[PDB]
PDB file of C-alpha atoms and ligand atoms in Angstrom:
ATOM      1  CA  UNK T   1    -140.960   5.771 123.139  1.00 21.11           C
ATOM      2  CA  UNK T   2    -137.360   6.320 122.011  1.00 19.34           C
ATOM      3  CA  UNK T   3    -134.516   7.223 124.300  1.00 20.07           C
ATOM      4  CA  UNK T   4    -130.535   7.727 123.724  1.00 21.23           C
ATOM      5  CA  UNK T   5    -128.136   6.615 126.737  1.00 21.22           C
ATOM      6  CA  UNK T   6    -124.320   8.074 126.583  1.00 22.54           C
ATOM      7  CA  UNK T   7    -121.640   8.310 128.990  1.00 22.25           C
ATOM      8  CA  UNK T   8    -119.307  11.119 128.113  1.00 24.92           C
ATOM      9  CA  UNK T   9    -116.019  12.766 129.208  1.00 21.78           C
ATOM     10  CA  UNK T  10    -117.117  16.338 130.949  1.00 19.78           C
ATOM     11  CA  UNK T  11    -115.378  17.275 127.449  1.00 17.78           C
ATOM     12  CA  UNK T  12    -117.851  15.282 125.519  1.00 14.94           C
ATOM     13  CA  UNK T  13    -115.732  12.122 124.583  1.00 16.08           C
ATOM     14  CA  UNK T  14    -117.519   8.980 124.251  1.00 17.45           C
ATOM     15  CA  UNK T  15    -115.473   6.552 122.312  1.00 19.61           C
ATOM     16  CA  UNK T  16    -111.346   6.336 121.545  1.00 26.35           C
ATOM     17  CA  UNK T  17    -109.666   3.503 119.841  1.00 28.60           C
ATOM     18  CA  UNK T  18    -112.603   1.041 119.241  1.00 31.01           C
ATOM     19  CA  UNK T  19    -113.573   1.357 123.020  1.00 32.88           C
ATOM     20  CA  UNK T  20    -114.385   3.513 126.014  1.00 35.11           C
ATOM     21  CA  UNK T  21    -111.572   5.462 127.799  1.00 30.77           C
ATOM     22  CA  UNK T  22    -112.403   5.270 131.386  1.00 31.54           C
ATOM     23  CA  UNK T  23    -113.717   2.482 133.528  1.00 30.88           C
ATOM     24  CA  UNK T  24    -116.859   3.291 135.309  1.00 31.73           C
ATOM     25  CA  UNK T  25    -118.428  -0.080 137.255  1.00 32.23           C
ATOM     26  CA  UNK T  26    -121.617   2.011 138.319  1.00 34.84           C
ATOM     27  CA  UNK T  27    -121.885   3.388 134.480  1.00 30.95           C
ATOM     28  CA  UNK T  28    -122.270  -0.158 133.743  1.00 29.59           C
ATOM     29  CA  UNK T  29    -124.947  -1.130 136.370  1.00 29.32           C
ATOM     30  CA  UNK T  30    -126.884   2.160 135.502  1.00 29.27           C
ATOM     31  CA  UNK T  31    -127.104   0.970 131.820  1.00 30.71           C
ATOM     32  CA  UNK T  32    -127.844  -2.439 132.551  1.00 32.06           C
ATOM     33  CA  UNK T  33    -130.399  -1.601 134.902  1.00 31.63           C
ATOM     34  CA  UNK T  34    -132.066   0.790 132.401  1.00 31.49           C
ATOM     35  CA  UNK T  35    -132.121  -1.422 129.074  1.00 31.63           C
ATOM     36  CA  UNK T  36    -132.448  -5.577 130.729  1.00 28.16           C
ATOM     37  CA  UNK T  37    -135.544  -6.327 129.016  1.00 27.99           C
ATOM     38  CA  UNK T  38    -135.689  -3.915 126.295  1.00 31.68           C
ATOM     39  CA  UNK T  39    -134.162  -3.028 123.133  1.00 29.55           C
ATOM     40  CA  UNK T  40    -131.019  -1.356 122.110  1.00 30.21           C
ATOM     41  CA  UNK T  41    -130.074  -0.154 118.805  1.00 29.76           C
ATOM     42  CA  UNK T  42    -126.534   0.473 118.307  1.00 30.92           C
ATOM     43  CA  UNK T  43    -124.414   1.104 115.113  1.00 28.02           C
ATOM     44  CA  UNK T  44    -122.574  -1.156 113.240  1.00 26.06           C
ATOM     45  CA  UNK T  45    -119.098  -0.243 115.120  1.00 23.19           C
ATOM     46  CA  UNK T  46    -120.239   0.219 118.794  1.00 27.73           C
ATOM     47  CA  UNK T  47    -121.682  -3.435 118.199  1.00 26.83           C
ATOM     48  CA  UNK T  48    -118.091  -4.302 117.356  1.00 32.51           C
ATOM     49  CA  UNK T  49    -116.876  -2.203 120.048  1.00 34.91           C
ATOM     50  CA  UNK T  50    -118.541  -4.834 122.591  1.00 33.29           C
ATOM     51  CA  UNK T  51    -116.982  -6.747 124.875  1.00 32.03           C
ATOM     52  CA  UNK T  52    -116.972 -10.961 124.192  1.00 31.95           C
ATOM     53  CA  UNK T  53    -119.154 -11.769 127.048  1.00 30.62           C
ATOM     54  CA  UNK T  54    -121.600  -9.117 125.792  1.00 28.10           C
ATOM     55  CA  UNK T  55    -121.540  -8.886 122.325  1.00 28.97           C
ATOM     56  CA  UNK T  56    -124.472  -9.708 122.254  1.00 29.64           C
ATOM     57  CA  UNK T  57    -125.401  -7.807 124.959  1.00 32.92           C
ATOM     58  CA  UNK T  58    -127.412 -10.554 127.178  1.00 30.08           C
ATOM     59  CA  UNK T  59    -131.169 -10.274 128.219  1.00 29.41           C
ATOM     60  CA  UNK T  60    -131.761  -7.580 125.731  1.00 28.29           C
ATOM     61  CA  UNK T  61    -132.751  -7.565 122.040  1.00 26.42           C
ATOM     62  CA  UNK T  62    -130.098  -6.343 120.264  1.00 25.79           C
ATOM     63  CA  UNK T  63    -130.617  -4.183 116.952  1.00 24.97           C
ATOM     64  CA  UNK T  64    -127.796  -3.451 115.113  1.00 25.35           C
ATOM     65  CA  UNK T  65    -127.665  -0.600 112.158  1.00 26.14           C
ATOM     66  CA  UNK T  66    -125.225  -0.924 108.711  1.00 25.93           C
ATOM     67  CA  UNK T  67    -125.423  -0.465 105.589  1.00 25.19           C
ATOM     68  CA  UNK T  68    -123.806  -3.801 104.351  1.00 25.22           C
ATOM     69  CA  UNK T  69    -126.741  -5.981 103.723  1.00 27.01           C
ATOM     70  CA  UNK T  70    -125.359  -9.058 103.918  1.00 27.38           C
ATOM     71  CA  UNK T  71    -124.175  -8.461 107.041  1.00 27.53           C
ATOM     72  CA  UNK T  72    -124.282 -11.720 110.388  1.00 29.36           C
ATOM     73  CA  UNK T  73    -124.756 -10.090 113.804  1.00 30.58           C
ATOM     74  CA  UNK T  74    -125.391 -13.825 115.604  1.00 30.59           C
ATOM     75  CA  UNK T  75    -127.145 -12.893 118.696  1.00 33.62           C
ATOM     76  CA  UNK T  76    -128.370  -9.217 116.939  1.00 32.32           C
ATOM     77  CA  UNK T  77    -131.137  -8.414 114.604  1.00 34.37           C
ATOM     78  CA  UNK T  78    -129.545  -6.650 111.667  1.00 36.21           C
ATOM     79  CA  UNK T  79    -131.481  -3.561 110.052  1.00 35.01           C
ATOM     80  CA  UNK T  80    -130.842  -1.255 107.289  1.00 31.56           C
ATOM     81  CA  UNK T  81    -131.470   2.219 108.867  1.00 29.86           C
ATOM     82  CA  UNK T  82    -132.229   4.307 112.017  1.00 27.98           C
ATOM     83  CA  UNK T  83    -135.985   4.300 111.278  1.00 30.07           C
ATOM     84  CA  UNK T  84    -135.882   0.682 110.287  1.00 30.81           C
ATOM     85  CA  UNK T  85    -134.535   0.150 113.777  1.00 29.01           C
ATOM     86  CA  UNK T  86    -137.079   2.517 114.963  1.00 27.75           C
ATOM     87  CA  UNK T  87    -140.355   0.179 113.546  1.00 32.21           C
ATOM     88  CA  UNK T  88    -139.810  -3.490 114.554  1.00 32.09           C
ATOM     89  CA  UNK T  89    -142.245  -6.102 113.718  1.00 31.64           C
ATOM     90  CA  UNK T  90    -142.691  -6.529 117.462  1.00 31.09           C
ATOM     91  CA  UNK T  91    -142.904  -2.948 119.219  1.00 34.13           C
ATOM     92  CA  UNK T  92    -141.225  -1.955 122.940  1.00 36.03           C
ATOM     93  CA  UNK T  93    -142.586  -0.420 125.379  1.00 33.83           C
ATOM     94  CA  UNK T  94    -139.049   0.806 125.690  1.00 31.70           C
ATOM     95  CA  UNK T  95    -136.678   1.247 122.872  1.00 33.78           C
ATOM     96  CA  UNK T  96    -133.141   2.797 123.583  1.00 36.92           C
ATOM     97  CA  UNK T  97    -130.508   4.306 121.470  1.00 32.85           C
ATOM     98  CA  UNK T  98    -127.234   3.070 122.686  1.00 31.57           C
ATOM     99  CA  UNK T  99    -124.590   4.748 120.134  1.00 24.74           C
ATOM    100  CA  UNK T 100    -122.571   5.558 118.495  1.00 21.87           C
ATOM    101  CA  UNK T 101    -121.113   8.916 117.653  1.00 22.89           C
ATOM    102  CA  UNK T 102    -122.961   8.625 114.189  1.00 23.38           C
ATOM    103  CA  UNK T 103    -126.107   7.130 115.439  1.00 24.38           C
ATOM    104  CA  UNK T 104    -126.597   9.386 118.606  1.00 25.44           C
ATOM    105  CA  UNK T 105    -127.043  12.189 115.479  1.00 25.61           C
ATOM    106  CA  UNK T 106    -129.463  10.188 113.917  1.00 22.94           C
ATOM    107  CA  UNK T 107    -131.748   9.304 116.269  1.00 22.31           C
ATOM    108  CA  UNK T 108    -131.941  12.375 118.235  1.00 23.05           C
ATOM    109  CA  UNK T 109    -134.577  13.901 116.135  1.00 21.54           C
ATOM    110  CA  UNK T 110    -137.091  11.087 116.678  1.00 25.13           C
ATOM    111  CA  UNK T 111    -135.833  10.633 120.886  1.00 27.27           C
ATOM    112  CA  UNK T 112    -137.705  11.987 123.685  1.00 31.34           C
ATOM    113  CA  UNK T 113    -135.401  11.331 126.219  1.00 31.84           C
ATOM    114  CA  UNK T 114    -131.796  11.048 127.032  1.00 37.26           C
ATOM    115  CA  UNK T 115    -130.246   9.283 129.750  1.00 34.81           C
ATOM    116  CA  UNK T 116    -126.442  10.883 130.118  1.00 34.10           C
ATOM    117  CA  UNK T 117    -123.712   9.740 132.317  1.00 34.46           C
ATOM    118  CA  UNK T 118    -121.162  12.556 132.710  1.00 34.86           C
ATOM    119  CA  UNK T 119    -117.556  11.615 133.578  1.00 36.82           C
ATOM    120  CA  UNK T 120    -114.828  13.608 135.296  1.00 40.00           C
ATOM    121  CA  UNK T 121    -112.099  12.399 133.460  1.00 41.93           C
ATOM    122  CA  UNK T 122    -109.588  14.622 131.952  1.00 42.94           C
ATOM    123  CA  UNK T 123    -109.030  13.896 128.539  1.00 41.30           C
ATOM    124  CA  UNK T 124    -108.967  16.361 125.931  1.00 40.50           C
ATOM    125  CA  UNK T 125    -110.269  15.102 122.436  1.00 42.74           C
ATOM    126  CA  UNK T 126    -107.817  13.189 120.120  1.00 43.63           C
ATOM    127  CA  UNK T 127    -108.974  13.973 116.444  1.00 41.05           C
ATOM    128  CA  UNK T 128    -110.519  10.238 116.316  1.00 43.88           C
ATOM    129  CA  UNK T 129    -112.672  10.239 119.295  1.00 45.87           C
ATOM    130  CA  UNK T 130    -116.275  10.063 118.891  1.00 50.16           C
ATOM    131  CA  UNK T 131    -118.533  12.814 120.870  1.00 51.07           C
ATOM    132  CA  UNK T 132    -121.258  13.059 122.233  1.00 48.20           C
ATOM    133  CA  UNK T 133    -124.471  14.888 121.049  1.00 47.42           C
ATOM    134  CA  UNK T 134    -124.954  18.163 122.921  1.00 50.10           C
ATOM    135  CA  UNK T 135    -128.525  18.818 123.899  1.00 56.25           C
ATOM    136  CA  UNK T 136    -130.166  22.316 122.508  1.00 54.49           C
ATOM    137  CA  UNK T 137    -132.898  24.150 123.592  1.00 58.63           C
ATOM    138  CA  UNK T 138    -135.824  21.932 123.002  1.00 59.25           C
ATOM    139  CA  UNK T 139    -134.733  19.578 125.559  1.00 60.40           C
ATOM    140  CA  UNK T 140    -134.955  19.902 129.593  1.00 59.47           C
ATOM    141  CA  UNK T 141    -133.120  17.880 132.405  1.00 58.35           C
ATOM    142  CA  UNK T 142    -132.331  17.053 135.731  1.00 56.86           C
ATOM    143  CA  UNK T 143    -128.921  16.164 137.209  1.00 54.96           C
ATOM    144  CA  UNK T 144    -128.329  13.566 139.456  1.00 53.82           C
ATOM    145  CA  UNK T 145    -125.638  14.753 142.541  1.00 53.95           C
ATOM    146  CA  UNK T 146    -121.809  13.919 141.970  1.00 54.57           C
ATOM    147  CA  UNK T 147    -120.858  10.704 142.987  1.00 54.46           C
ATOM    148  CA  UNK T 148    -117.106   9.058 143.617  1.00 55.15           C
ATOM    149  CA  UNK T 149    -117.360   5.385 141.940  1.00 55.96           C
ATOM    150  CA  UNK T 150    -115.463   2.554 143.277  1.00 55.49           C
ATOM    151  CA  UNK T 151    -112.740   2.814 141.386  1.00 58.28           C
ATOM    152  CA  UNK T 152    -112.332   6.452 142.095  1.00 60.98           C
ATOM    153  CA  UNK T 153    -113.723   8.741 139.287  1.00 67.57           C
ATOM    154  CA  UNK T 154    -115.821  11.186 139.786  1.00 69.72           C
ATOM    155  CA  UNK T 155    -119.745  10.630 137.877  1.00 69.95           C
ATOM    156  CA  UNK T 156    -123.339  12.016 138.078  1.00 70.81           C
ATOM    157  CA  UNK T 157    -126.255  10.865 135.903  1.00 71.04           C
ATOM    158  CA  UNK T 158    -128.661  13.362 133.824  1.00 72.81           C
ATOM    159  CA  UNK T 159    -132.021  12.808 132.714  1.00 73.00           C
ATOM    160  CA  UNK T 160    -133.042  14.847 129.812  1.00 70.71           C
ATOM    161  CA  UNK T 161    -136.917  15.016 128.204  1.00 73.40           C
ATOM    162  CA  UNK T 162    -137.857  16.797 125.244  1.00 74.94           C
ATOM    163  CA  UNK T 163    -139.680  19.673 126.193  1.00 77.18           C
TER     164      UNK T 163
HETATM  165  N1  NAP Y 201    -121.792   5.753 125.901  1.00 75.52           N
HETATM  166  C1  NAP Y 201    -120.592   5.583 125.449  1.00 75.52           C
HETATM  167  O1  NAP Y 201    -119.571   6.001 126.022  1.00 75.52           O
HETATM  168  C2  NAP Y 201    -120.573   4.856 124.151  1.00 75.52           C
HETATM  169  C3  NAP Y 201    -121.689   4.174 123.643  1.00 75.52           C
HETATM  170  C4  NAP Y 201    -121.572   3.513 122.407  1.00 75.52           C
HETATM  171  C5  NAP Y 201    -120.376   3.548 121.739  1.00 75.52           C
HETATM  172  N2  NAP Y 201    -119.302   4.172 122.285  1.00 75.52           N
HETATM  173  C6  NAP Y 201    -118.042   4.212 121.514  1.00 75.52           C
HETATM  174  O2  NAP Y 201    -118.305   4.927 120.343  1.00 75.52           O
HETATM  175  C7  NAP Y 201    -117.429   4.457 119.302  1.00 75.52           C
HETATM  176  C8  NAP Y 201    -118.301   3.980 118.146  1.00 75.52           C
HETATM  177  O3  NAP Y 201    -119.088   5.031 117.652  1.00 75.52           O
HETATM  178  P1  NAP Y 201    -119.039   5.503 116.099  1.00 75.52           P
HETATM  179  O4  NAP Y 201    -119.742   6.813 116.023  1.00 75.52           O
HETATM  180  O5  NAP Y 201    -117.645   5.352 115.585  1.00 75.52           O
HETATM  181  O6  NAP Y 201    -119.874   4.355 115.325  1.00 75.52           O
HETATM  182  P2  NAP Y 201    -121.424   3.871 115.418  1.00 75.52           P
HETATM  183  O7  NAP Y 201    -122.359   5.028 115.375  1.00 75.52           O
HETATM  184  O8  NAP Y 201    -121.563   2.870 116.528  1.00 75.52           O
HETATM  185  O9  NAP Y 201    -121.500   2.968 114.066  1.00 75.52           O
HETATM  186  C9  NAP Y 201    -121.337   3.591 112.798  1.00 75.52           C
HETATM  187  C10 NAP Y 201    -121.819   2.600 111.758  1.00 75.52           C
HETATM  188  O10 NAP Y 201    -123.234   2.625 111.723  1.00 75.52           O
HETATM  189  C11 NAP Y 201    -123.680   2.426 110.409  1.00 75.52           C
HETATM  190  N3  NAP Y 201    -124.422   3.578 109.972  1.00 75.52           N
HETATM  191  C12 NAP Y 201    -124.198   4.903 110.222  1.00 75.52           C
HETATM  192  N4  NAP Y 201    -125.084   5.665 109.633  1.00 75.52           N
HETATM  193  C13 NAP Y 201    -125.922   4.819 108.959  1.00 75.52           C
HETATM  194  C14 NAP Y 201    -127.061   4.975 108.148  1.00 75.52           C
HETATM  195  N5  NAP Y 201    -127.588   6.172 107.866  1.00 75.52           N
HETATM  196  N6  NAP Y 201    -127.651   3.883 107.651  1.00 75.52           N
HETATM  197  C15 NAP Y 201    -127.140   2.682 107.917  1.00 75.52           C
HETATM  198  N7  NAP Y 201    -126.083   2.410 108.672  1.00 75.52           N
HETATM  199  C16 NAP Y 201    -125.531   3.508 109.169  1.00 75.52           C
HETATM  200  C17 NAP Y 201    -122.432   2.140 109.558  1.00 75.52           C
HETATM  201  O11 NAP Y 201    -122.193   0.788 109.659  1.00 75.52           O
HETATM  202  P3  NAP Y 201    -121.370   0.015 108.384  1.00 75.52           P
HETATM  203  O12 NAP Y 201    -119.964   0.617 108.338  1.00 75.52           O
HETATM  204  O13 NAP Y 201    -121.405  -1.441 108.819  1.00 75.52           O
HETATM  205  O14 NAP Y 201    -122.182   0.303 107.135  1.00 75.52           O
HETATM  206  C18 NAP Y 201    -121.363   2.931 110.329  1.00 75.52           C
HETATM  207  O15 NAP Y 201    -120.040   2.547 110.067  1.00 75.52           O
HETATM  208  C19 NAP Y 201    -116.579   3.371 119.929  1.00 75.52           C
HETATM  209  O16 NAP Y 201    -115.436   3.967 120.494  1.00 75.52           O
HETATM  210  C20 NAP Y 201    -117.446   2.878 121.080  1.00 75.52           C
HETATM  211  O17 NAP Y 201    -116.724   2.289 122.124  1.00 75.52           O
HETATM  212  C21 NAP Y 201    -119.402   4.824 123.453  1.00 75.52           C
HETATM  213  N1  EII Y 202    -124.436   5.065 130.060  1.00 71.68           N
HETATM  214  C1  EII Y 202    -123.979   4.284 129.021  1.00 71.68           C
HETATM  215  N2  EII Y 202    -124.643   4.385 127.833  1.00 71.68           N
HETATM  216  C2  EII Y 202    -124.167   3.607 126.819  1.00 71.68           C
HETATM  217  N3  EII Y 202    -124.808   3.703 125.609  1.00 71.68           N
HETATM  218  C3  EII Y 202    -123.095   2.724 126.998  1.00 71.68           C
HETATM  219  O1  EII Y 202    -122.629   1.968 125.945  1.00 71.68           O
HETATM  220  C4  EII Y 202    -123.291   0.713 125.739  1.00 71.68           C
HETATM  221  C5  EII Y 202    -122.550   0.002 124.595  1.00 71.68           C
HETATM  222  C6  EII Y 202    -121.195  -0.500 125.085  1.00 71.68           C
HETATM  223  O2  EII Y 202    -121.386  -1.498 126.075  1.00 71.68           O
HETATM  224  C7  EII Y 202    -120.318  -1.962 126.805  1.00 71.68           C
HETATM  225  C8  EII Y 202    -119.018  -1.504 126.582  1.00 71.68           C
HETATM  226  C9  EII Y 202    -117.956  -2.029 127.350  1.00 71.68           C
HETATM  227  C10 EII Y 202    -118.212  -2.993 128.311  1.00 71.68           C
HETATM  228  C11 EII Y 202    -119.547  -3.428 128.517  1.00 71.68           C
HETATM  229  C12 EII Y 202    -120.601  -2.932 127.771  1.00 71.68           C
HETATM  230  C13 EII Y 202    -122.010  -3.434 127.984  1.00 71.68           C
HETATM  231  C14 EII Y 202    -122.310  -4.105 129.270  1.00 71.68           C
HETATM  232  C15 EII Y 202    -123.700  -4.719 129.278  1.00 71.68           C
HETATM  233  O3  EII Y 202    -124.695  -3.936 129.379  1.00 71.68           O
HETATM  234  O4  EII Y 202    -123.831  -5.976 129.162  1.00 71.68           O
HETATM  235  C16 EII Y 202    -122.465   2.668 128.238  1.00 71.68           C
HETATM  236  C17 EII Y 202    -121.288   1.755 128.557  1.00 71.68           C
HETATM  237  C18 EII Y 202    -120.040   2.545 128.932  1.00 71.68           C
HETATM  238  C19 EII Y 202    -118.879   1.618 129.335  1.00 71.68           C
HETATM  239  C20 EII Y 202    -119.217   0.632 130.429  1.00 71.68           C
HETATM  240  C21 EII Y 202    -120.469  -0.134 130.108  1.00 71.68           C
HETATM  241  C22 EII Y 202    -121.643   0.762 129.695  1.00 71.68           C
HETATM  242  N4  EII Y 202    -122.916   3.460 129.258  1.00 71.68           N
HETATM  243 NA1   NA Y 203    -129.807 -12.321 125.591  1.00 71.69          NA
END
């Protein structure tokens, strides 16, 4: 089955500046915790997006989705398209969605479940940040209680299933 995980800005930012505007330590542990061992499919720029020590990210088969064909991704498997992503040669029992922006749209039509991490953080959206999907009617979820991290922001997790 096919899952997205996001952590957003309560106003829905996910991504400024080639990065991630906030520093969440738990965020990172929750995501860890819910992809070691699986696979993650990412576009092209959130695999560029990642960190040195975690490009690619380690213990975790890493799928990464452009258009340029003759693209290198050493340490990634390098496909062609969302659904090409979506039908390795050696299936999951677990497959998650890990971003971006452009991919989150993609792949929400063939997900069944979304694993969001909302932030408070105040930042208002700068005309190049990349958002978040918003969830319509034909999904369901279950919030998680709010939580002060370490490093003192404010967090709570949601789990959403398609209905
Ligand atoms: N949870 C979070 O907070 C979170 C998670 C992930 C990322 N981020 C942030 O999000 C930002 C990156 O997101 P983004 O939306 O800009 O980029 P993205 O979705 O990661 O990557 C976009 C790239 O994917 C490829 N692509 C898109 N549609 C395609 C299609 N139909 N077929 C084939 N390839 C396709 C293209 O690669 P080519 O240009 O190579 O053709 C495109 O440039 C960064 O700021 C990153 O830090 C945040
Ligand atoms: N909930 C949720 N879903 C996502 N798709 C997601 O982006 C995952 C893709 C970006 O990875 C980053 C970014 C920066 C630093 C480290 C990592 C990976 C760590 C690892 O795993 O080796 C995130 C990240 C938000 C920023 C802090 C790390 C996790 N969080
Ligand atoms: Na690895």
């Amino acid at each position: 089955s096919v899952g997205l995980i996001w952590a957003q800005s309560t106003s829905g930012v996910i991504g400024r500046d080639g990065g991630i505007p906030w520093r969440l330590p738990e965020d990172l542990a929750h995501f860890k915790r819910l992809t070691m061992g699986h696979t993650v499919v990412m576009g092209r720029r959130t695999w560029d997006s990642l960190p040195a020590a975690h490009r690619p990210l380690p213990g975790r088969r890493n799928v990464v989705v452009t258009r340029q064909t003759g693209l290198v991704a050493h340490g990634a498997q390098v496909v062609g398209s969302l659904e090409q992503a979506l039908s390795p040669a050696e299936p999951d029992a677990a497959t998650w969605v890990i971003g971006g922006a452009q991919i989150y749209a993609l792949a929400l039509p063939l997900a069944n479940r979304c694993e969001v991490t909302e932030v408070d953080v105040d930042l208002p959206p700068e005309d190049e940040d990349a958002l978040a999907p918003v969830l319509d009617q034909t999904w369901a979820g279950t919030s998680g209680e709010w939580l002060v991290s370490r490093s003192g922001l404010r967090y709570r997790m949601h789990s959403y299933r398609r209905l």
